[PDB]
Design a protein around this ligand. Structure first.
Ligand SMILES: [Zn+2]
Ligand SMILES: [Zn+2]
Ligand SMILES: [Zn+2]
Lengths: 142, 681, 202
């Protein structure tokens, strides 16, 4: 059981080993709809570097539809300001390569290649509730 | 006698020779061949007094003045290249010397410099890297007030000159002019020098930023990310405030009043919808004056804030629609309050609290009020009436929440209030809603309250408004030169009146009745007593009030754009009463027109009124004796004909600012009836 | 070499300080020296190239807290074996630093590093003092270097290894623990894409 608030695994690979099971074996519910994830979504949850949410010692993930939906709502709600990557580097005194930026549509962390694309196409990064986001390749092409 | 760098002594070699040969051209050759070179200047000296002596000697000759001007015009465009492409300051931190040398020239503000030389120099200077600006600002903060005034004036004249000389319109924006933008960035550099040069109190006055927890949906997304404890991130902070380590809010008293940094000509020309857009979305080719808030007047700032509020209200409306499309749930796009005239405080509390607990984001919707039993569309008049009722009810001494001072006509929190922290939260929310909906409220708080709302504790000096009988007494105690212990016999214990009039003894320090106040501890006692009256006596109530207010303003640029003195203006409105502007915007109904004899006589009378009669006239026609943000010209007053000549007094509808005026037969009768109405109301 | 050893517990434990790790999100291009996969919870890096690791805590640990790195084989049949640098690299002149030629892990840029051999299990570990984040930072970055290739015969010999990072007090008591898998290889971006694709295909 995961009824200890502090000492339960946070990332899906850890939960796999903690339940002595593999990502190919495990079945999980989405935290909003409590519907079961498709295996394709489970993989993507691992690839998106998201955290397991726990209620009463039960683990919950997030499916694709819910994640995109709540992210889009969060964009509409807590948008702050948009800066060029170059300007952003100066505000944080670090190169964009190192700065933590996630996909605004699907939370996947942005690769340095995608970060470069933002600089190449003179596109801005959006501050939402105090965290920075951009658009990954799979969301700038759709 | 060619030389690569210059000094006072080297200059003197020529002063004498030029006088002796009755010439100036050699010294002009020299000064030109010097001051056209950035390197020569950077290498020449920091020797402020030497520079000052040199300028005081050289600028005495007209021929040499034109040479300085002509050298500066040559110098600056090259310096811009060094800073923009070669990062020279990162190779030699002495490069800043150049600007220090030039700025000590007293004649930079004469028109000959304003037209070309100073603009170019501003373009160069405004490109300095932040660390260099921080070095320069820290130096300027040691200058005399008149010198800050001179530097401020040097750029103010330039911004004024360029705004007046160029034709700006919706296609040619002030935001597209490099000269004004560069000048503004320079002026910003002076502004922070004025801030840092003032009195700054950072170690005894900070209050914690209390944030309302977001709705469960955002919480889950924050939990799905690694942000469970990272709820506190602050608003958009100015890079210079970060580099200097001092906020605009930290300076208790500047060298030059902040109001003198407001450039009214610029404010008359600036289009705020586009500026707010450039503030929100960074574009490489356009600037935003909201990044330089000190230059904007309260009207212009409020218009920016109003765009923020409206854009958010509209975002919440989009979210409402999106929720309805994906999950079928029907949410109200307005903050619809329904209340009974006999239970306004209770109904408003339960509703706003259920809303704040179920969904704290709902408080950011557009306000819409409905009195249970009444029927009308809330175009703001019903809301205004709701605010009047709430404010009147909350300040009634029978509710015991506030104490009213007859002397200052200001309200202050009752320390002895048994009423629940709910009512204090409600009044806090009401203030927020008023700013959010641009409605002026007839609330009368001393400056300490607005400081506490911004997160600064009230200090001894703030008693000067809230408790004059107290402030004076404490000031007297500080000024006294005898043995405080033997002469005043006061201890670390004070007396406070309960609702039932009983004196409650409060110990400022443990067993305070046994601890005497001595000359060495009196300043501490004053700090503690001030801290008790301004904080620790009302802290229970005030903390609730402040929470209520932040529930509406937590994400607003308010903390960045405004100061306590300007918050008051947003909530209560201005004390300046321009009746000419009121005449220009007044509308006429019932068959009156601007060319009607009675209307012309009305304006002759109203212009001849005293300021007190004018305040009474506004109170009568509008329900408040203050003018909205931007003056009386923003008040859409309507003079509506209330029948032919009669013995009746005029009447008013304060919820819509309508004056029901009979068509009197004479100017004297109009004056006498109008004076009587506004005096006896 | 020591032929047997006890098995240190590998279970993640955030403890009273919320101890968790982070990694700089790197691409998969042929030129990448180091790159991390969240799906595999796995680090791919080149021999003796800098691997940056971020440390995250909810509250600052007590003074004298330390950060220890210890390596074990991931496959249960080998968890009792000590991970040692392969002999050809144990024989290489590159061990000129302050870490034993048999130590696989080295720390770059921090001279308060202690290369410690477990007196009871013989396991090789690297320890540094815990340092709070810099002004303006939320996390502390440590730089690790792996001095042997996972494919090495007589050493790792293609067996996957798990790096366990432990947050400990000044006496070695466990304040927090987390862990991740490592692959030292000539082409991280390629190997990462390969293992990730194999995972997605399953
Ligand atoms: Zn779902
Ligand atoms: Zn995406
Ligand atoms: Zn090897």
């Amino acid at each position: 059981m995961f009824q200890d608030p502090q000492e339960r695994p946070r990332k899906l690979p850890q939960l796999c080993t903690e339940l002595q099971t593999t990502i190919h074996d495990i079945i999980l519910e989405c935290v909003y709809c409590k519907q079961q994830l498709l295996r394709r979504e489970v993989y993507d949850f691992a690839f998106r570097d998201l955290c397991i949410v726990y209620r009463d010692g039960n683990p919950y993930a997030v499916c694709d539809k819910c994640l995109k939906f709540y992210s889009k709502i969060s964009e509409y709600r807590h948008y702050s300001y948009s800066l060029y990557g170059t300007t952003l580097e100066q505000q944080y005194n670090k190169p964009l390569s190192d700065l933590l930026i996630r996909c605004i549509n699907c939370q996947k962390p942005l690769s340095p290649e995608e970060k470069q694309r933002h600089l190449d196409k003179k596109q801005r990064f959006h501050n939402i509730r105090g965290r920075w986001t951009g658009r990954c390749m799979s969301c700038s092409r759709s | 006698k060619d030389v690569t760098y210059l000094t006072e002594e080297k200059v003197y070699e020529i002063l004498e020779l030029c006088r002796e040969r009755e010439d100036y051209s050699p010294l002009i050759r020299v000064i030109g061949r010097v001051f056209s070179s950035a390197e020569a200047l950077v290498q020449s000296f920091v020797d402020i007094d030497a520079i000052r002596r040199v300028y005081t000697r050289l600028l005495s000759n007209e021929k040499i003045e034109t040479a300085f001007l002509n050298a500066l015009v040559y110098l600056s465009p090259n310096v811009e290249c060094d800073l923009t492409y070669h990062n020279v300051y990162s190779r030699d931190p002495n490069y800043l010397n150049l600007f220090i040398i030039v700025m000590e020239n007293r004649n930079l503000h004469s028109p000959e410099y304003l037209e070309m030389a100073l603009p170019l120099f501003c373009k160069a200077m405004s490109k300095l890297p932040l660390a260099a600006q921080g070095k320069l600002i820290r130096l300027w903060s040691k200058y005399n007030a008149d010198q800050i005034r001179r530097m401020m004036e040097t750029f103010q004249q330039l911004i004024t000159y360029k705004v007046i000389s160029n034709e700006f319109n919706s296609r040619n924006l002030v935001n597209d002019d490099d000269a004004i933008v560069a000048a503004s960035k320079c002026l910003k550099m002076v502004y922070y020098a004025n801030v840092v040069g003032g009195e700054v109190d950072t170690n005894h006055n900070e209050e914690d930023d209390e944030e309302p927890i977001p709705e469960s949906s955002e919480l889950t997304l924050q939990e799905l990310l690694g942000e469970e404890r990272r709820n506190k991130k602050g608003p958009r902070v100015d890079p210079l405030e970060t580099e200097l380590g001092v906020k605009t809010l930290d300076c208790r008293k500047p060298l030059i009043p902040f109001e003198e940094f407001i450039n009214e000509p610029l404010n008359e020309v600036l289009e705020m919808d586009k500026d707010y857009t450039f503030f929100k979305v960074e574009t490489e080719n356009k600037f935003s004056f909201m990044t330089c808030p000190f230059i904007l007047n309260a009207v212009t700032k409020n218009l920016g804030l109003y765009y923020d509020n409206r854009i958010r209200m509209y975002s919440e409306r989009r979210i409402t629609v999106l929720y309805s499309l994906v999950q079928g749930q029907q949410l109200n796009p307005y903050l619809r309050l329904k209340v009974r005239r006999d239970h306004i405080i209770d109904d408003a509390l339960v509703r706003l609290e259920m809303i704040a607990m179920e969904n704290p984001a709902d408080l950011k919707k557009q306000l819409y009020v409905e009195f249970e039993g009444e029927q009308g569309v809330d175009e703001g008049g019903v809301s205004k009436e709701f605010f009047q009722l709430v404010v009147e009810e909350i300040f009634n001494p029978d509710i015991g929440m506030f104490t009213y001072d007859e002397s200052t006509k200001l309200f202050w929190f009752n320390p002895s209030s048994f009423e629940t922290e709910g009512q204090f939260t409600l009044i806090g929310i009401v203030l927020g809603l008023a700013i959010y909906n641009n409605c002026i409220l007839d609330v009368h708080f001393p400056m300490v309250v607005y400081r506490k709302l911004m997160g600064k504790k009230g200090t001894f000096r703030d008693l000067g408004d809230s408790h004059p009988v107290l402030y004076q007494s404490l000031k007297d105690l500080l000024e006294y030169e005898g043995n405080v212990e033997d002469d005043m016999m006061i201890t670390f214990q004070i007396s406070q009146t309960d609702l039932f009039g009983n004196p409650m003894m409060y110990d400022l320090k443990e067993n305070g009745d046994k601890i005497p106040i001595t000359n060495e501890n009196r300043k501490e006692f004053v700090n503690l007593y001030s801290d008790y009256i301004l904080n620790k006596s009302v802290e229970k109530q005030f903390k609730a009030f402040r929470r209520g207010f932040h529930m509406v303003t937590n994400e607003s640029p308010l903390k960045y754009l405004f100061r306590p003195e300007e918050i008051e203006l947003l909530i209560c409105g201005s004390r300046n009463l321009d009746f000419q502007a009121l005449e220009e915007t007044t509308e006429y109904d019932g068959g009156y027109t601007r060319d009607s004899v009675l209307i012309r006589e009305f304006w002759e009378i109203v212009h001849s009124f005293t300021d007190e009669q004018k305040r009474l006239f506004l109170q009568f026609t509008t329900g408040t004796d203050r003018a909205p943000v931007g003056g009386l010209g923003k008040l859409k007053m309507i003079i509506a004909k209330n029948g032919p000549d009669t013995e009746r007094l005029p009447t008013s509808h304060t919820c819509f600012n309508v004056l029901l005026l009979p068509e009197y037969s004479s100017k004297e009768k109009l004056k006498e009836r109008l004076l009587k109405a506004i005096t006896y109301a | 070499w020591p032929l047997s050893s006890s098995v240190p517990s590998q279970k993640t434990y955030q403890g009273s300080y919320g101890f968790r790790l982070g990694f700089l999100h790197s691409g998969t291009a042929k030129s990448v020296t180091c790159t991390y996969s969240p799906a595999l919870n796995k680090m791919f890096c080149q021999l003796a190239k800098t691997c940056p690791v971020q440390l995250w805590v909810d509250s600052t640990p007590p003074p004298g807290t330390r950060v220890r790195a210890m390596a074990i084989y991931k496959q249960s049949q080998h968890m009792t074996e000590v991970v040692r640098r392969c002999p050809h690299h144990e024989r290489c002149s590159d061990s000129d630093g302050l870490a034993p030629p048999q130590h696989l892990i080295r720390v770059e840029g921090n001279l308060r590093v202690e290369y410690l051999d477990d007196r009871n299990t013989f396991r090789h570990s690297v320890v540094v003092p815990y340092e709070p984040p810099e002004v303006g930072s939320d996390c502390t970055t440590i730089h690790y270097n792996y001095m042997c290739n996972s494919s090495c015969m007589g050493g790792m010999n293609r067996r996957p290894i798990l790096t366990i990072i432990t947050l400990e007090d000044s006496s070695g008591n466990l304040l927090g623990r987390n862990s991740f898998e490592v692959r030292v290889c000539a082409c991280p971006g390629r190997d990462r894409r390969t293992e990730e694709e194999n995972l997605r295909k399953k």
